[PDB]
Amino acid sequence: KEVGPKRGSLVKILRPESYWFNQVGKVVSVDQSGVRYPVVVRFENQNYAGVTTNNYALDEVVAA
Amino acid sequence: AHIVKIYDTCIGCTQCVRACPLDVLEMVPWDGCKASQMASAPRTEDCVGCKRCETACPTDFLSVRVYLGSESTRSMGLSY
Amino acid sequence: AWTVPTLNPDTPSPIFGGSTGGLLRKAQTEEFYVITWEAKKEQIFEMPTGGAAIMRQGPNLLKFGKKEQCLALTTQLRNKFKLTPCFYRVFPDGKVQYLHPADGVYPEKVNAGRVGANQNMRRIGQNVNPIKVKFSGRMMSPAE
Amino acid sequence: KKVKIAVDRNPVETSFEKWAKPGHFSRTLSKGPNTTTWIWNLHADAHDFDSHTSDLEEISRKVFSAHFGQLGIIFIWLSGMYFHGARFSNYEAWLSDP
Amino acid sequence: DIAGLTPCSESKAYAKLEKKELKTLEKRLKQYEADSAPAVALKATMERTKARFANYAKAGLLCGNDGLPHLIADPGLALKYGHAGEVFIPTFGFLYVAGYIGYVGRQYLIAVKGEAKPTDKEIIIDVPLATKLAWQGAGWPLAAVQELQRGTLLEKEENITVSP
Amino acid sequence: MKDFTTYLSTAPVIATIWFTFTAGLLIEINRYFPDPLVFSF
Ligand code: CLA
Ligand code: CLA
Ligand SMILES: CC1=C(/C=C/C(C)=C/C=C/C(C)=C\C=C\C=C(C)\C=C\C=C(C)\C=C\C2=C(C)CCCC2(C)C)C(C)(C)CCC1
Ligand code: SF4
Ligand code: SF4
């Protein structure tokens, strides 16, 4: 089926080395292929490089 | 000889290769991304470690990564 | 089709009256790196060792003492002027080594046949702790 | 006459609309803050007129009217010292016994 | 006389230093006519000075070996001996105003996050909103301790960490 | 002049109005209350 959350849901990042750990953002798209890190999340909190988006895996990512 | 090791969080946007002022980095096929490419460092003998690669990686907690090792006459950037 | 071009030193230099920022005694002992390109028209580029040299039509041969001094020359020869250079590495025993388009294609674009060295099939946040890599002969990063 | 007066009539509308949007001079600043480095880069890049635009005419008009701003502040500064020389001083008494 | 001290109305180096200052003002006063504003100013300085010594002795401030008003910052030695106005009254007169500025600035930040882009309204302060929270925050300890009882003051472990 | 009142509502302009408010309030109090070292009645 369509793995990952829906197209524009809110989400919580659980990657402990990411800059947005324990922090809430919006999924923008989930790539439906054998990519290791499909889930693309956009934030309002920009990082130290000014990059507001990142790819995450299916398991580092929890709803609400 | 500096230690440059990159990781699977690469997305293959090849901004590290274009930013490398010493041709340390090049782009190898790899299926774990949409752009079908992942970097590689076959020329870490020539690296100075100026870290222009990881100023340019977009991914959070940078995919390319430079470890400052033991410095030869090419790593210290010497014309002499 | 492409493989490993050689060099003749017969090819003319750019017209440059010489700077004090050029080679040093390292060129006579360790190594010095020569750079070639094919210019369409006569125009004026900047030397990475300070100043300005004019390129002439056909091949152009120039020599430096660092690798960044050659690649910071091709960076303004490829982006500004859309030329295709390549620089080599000359040792004082006459040996020469081909460096920058090392498989023909420039390293920003995939060649599909170059080998992926120095990679980790794991995430940077999944390194081991330094207590595990302690007493590894020499001092050693946990990313190995 | 190669040496001649040459101006342009009304290049910029006199309007407070751009005072509402700080960082309007630069592309990198006009999208608002997300970081306290925005408000330091606002004051750092403020008079870097060569970095706002590429047009040398637009740079030149900016440094020509900014010089009236520096001269206009010097004329306030001089007029302060004559005023503080007038109403709060002893210049009347100083001339008799200097 | 609490900790080797003495009342400033009772010590003499205090009164000696008062007479030291008024001596310096009067020998400065002597250079001017009695109508002149450089002498009107100095006699107004003295009447601010002499009332200042009268008011410090009125409050029962403690002098010591140097004849200066020493403060007692301990309740139980200020409540017992009548000196809560030195420290113990302004330690709550401050902490009313301090947490007031904290609470108004808190409520302005909480009530700006539910917007389009809240970073714009930290440059451009919503003055009809900010003054509205400024006036109505005057009972902030009455509002904070009610927020303290819920669990809405402290955000939970949604907070950001590195490697616990 | 709505855009002009946005400028009056920026961060440094409200800072330089409110600091003239708060200093100017404490200046007038320290005029009409000369030298308050201790809280009297
Ligand atoms: C943190 C250190 C510290 C501390 C504790 C003090 C403490 C004090 N200083 Mg000092 N000072 C300091 C640092 C400090 N200072 C520094 C760093 C400097 C150098 C800049 C000075 C320079 C200085 C000078 C030059 C003087 C003092 C004075 C004073 C006294 C304050 C008198 C006063 O203004 O009462 C203020 C009284 C109030 C009642 C203020 C309360 C505010 C309002 C009224 C309450 C709100 C009411 C209402 C609800 C609001 C209305 C708004 C409306 C919209 C509703 C007090 C002992 C003065 C003094 O007398 O010395 C002893 C004095 O002359 N200080
Ligand atoms: C004719 C005088 C003049 C003029 C027109 C300029 C013009 C310029 N300079 Mg320049 N400069 C000057 C003299 C001048 N400079 C002098 C005398 C020095 C040596 C000190 C420099 C050193 C200098 C450097 C190092 C740089 C510039 C830069 C710039 C550009 C942008 C400046 C800007 O936006 O800052 C806006 C204004 C400020 C941020 C204010 C700075 C705050 C100052 C440092 C605090 C001091 C104020 C006061 C003296 C202290 C008391 C205040 C009180 C409240 C405590 C602009 C082209 C910059 C540039 O081109 O970037 C690429 C840059 O990096 N200049
Ligand atoms: C009596 C006195 C004293 C003593 C004191 C003491 C001893 C104290 C203790 C204290 C303590 C032991 C404390 C603790 C604390 C804790 C905590 C934890 C806190 C917290 C706080 C908070 C949390 C707040 C918050 C807020 C709000 C809510 C409002 C405002 C703003 C803000 C946000 C900040 C002395 C002599 C010195 C002086 C005088 C007075
Ligand atoms: S790191 Fe950033 S730049 Fe280097 S390859 Fe991976 S993605 Fe492209
Ligand atoms: S380390 Fe310095 S040289 Fe080696 S790649 Fe990164 S940037 Fe280029």
Side-chain angles (χ1 to χ4, degrees):
Chain A
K1 292 185 178 182
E2 294 86 5
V3 71
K6 66 185 290 185
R7 185 67 59 84
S9 65
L10 273 302
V11 83
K12 185 178 178 184
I13 298 298
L14 298 177
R15 182 184 293 175
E17 61 264 13
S18 177
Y19 174 70
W20 298 274
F21 179 62
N22 288 320
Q23 197 167 4
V24 179
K26 290 180 184 177
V27 179
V28 298
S29 65
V30 177
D31 186 72
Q32 293 296 321
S33 178
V35 179
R36 295 184 186 273
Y37 301 99
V39 178
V40 193
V41 185
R42 187 178 293 121
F43 299 99
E44 294 291 327
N45 201 154
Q46 72 186 1
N47 54 1
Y48 296 106
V51 176
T52 64
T53 185
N54 195 13
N55 289 322
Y56 296 101
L58 275 303
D59 55 352
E60 296 177 354
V61 156
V62 68
Chain B
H2 298 289
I3 305 298
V4 180
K5 298 290 182 182
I6 79 160
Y7 293 91
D8 61 355
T9 323
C10 167
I11 65 171
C13 71
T14 184
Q15 298 298 317
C16 74
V17 177
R18 295 191 178 97
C20 168
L22 285 167
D23 196 1
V24 184
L25 300 167
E26 70 182 2
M27 297 305 292
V28 175
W30 179 66
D31 57 350
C33 66
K34 289 185 261 74
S36 298
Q37 56 183 355
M38 179 167 69
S40 177
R43 289 182 291 274
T44 61
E45 299 290 329
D46 292 331
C47 166
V48 294
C50 72
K51 292 178 178 290
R52 289 186 187 177
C53 72
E54 54 184 357
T55 59
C57 165
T59 63
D60 189 7
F61 189 47
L62 289 306
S63 302
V64 293
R65 190 64 175 170
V66 177
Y67 296 91
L68 293 167
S70 60
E71 288 83 2
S72 67
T73 182
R74 289 195 293 268
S75 296
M76 291 294 287
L78 297 175
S79 294
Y80 57 93
Chain C
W2 180 80
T3 180
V4 192
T6 60
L7 183 140
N8 48 356
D10 186 75
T11 59
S13 67
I15 301 166
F16 182 72
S19 68
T20 63
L23 294 176
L24 287 175
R25 289 173 65 91
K26 184 250 186 64
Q28 290 177 350
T29 66
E30 289 179 353
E31 60 190 3
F32 67 100
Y33 300 179
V34 298
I35 182 170
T36 62
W37 63 94
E38 295 176 353
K40 291 179 67 64
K41 61 181 182 179
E42 183 177 3
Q43 64 187 355
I44 309 172
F45 67 98
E46 185 179 4
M47 291 294 290
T49 62
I54 68 172
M55 62 180 76
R56 68 183 75 187
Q57 297 181 359
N60 291 317
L61 182 66
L62 193 60
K63 54 175 74 177
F64 294 103
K66 287 174 68 176
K67 194 178 179 183
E68 191 176 359
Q69 285 187 354
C70 297
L71 183 55
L73 183 58
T74 75
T75 308
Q76 72 172 356
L77 291 176
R78 291 177 65 250
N79 290 315
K80 291 172 94 288
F81 297 152
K82 302 297 183 291
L83 300 175
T84 57
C86 61
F87 60 90
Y88 301 175
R89 171 182 294 165
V90 184
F91 294 93
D93 60 357
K95 193 261 186 180
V96 66
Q97 185 181 5
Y98 181 78
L99 264 64
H100 178 64
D103 51 355
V105 184
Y106 290 99
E108 66 268 16
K109 193 174 74 176
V110 173
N111 207 170
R114 62 182 71 172
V115 177
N118 282 315
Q119 292 173 352
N120 289 322
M121 295 299 173
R122 65 185 172 88
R123 192 175 64 246
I124 178 175
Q126 291 175 351
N127 288 319
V128 299
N129 291 307
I131 189 67
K132 300 285 103 177
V133 296
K134 186 179 273 194
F135 300 109
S136 176
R138 69 187 187 274
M139 66 183 293
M140 187 172 180
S141 298
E144 300 177 356
Chain D
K1 301 290 174 66
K2 183 61 70 176
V3 176
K4 61 181 287 292
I5 300 166
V7 303
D8 195 1
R9 296 179 184 179
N10 296 318
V12 177
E13 179 178 0
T14 300
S15 174
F16 298 93
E17 190 268 335
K18 289 182 181 178
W19 298 11
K21 294 181 180 181
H24 62 89
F25 50 85
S26 179
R27 181 176 294 176
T28 67
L29 298 179
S30 64
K31 290 185 286 187
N34 202 4
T35 284
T36 57
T37 318
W38 189 82
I39 61 176
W40 297 115
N41 293 323
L42 172 60
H43 295 89
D45 290 328
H47 296 167
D48 193 3
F49 291 162
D50 190 76
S51 70
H52 298 175
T53 59
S54 62
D55 196 4
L56 184 63
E57 182 181 2
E58 182 64 32
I59 295 168
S60 300
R61 291 173 181 168
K62 286 185 183 183
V63 312
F64 178 63
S65 296
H67 290 175
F68 288 110
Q70 169 69 74
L71 290 176
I73 287 169
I74 293 171
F75 281 116
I76 294 173
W77 173 72
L78 282 171
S79 180
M81 304 312 112
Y82 289 105
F83 186 80
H84 291 280
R87 297 277 79 83
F88 301 105
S89 292
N90 53 357
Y91 182 74
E92 295 291 329
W94 181 75
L95 291 170
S96 299
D97 195 4
Chain E
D1 186 76
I2 295 173
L5 293 174
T6 175
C8 291
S9 65
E10 294 294 327
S11 67
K12 299 288 102 178
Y14 180 75
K16 185 178 260 76
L17 185 57
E18 178 181 358
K19 292 180 183 293
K20 180 178 179 294
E21 292 179 352
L22 269 297
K23 181 68 181 298
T24 57
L25 288 168
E26 185 177 359
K27 68 179 73 173
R28 185 178 175 186
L29 183 67
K30 287 172 68 176
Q31 297 178 358
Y32 294 99
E33 296 288 329
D35 292 333
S36 63
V40 176
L42 289 173
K43 290 186 260 74
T45 302
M46 296 176 185
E47 296 295 325
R48 289 191 298 268
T49 301
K50 294 174 74 70
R52 186 177 64 242
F53 285 89
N55 208 159
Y56 291 166
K58 183 180 262 76
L61 288 175
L62 292 173
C63 283
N65 290 316
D66 295 334
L68 296 176
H70 298 92
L71 304 179
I72 302 298
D74 176 70
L77 272 73
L79 291 171
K80 186 182 288 185
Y81 295 95
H83 289 91
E86 291 180 353
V87 171
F88 184 74
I89 291 171
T91 187
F92 293 102
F94 177 71
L95 286 178
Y96 182 72
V97 189
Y100 184 84
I101 301 167
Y103 184 77
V104 172
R106 182 190 174 93
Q107 292 297 107
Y108 181 76
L109 291 177
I110 290 176
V112 80
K113 301 293 176 65
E115 285 175 351
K117 192 159 90 275
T119 65
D120 294 336
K121 284 173 89 282
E122 292 186 357
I123 295 171
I124 299 172
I125 291 99
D126 198 0
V127 184
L129 181 60
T131 62
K132 185 256 290 181
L133 273 305
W135 289 103
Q136 78 186 4
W140 70 269
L142 282 75
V145 73
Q146 292 297 323
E147 189 178 2
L148 191 278
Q149 288 177 355
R150 300 290 180 270
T152 55
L153 182 67
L154 288 172
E155 187 175 0
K156 295 183 180 181
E157 294 174 354
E158 190 186 0
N159 297 322
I160 185 171
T161 58
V162 178
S163 295
Chain F
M1 64 178 290
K2 183 179 90 275
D3 287 328
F4 177 65
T5 55
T6 57
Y7 177 76
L8 266 293
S9 68
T10 58
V13 181
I14 292 178
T16 191
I17 287 167
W18 186 255
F19 289 162
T20 56
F21 181 80
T22 51
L25 183 59
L26 269 297
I27 283 168
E28 295 290 346
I29 293 168
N30 287 114
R31 176 174 62 187
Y32 293 105
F33 292 92
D35 299 330
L37 179 61
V38 61
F39 178 67
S40 65
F41 296 100

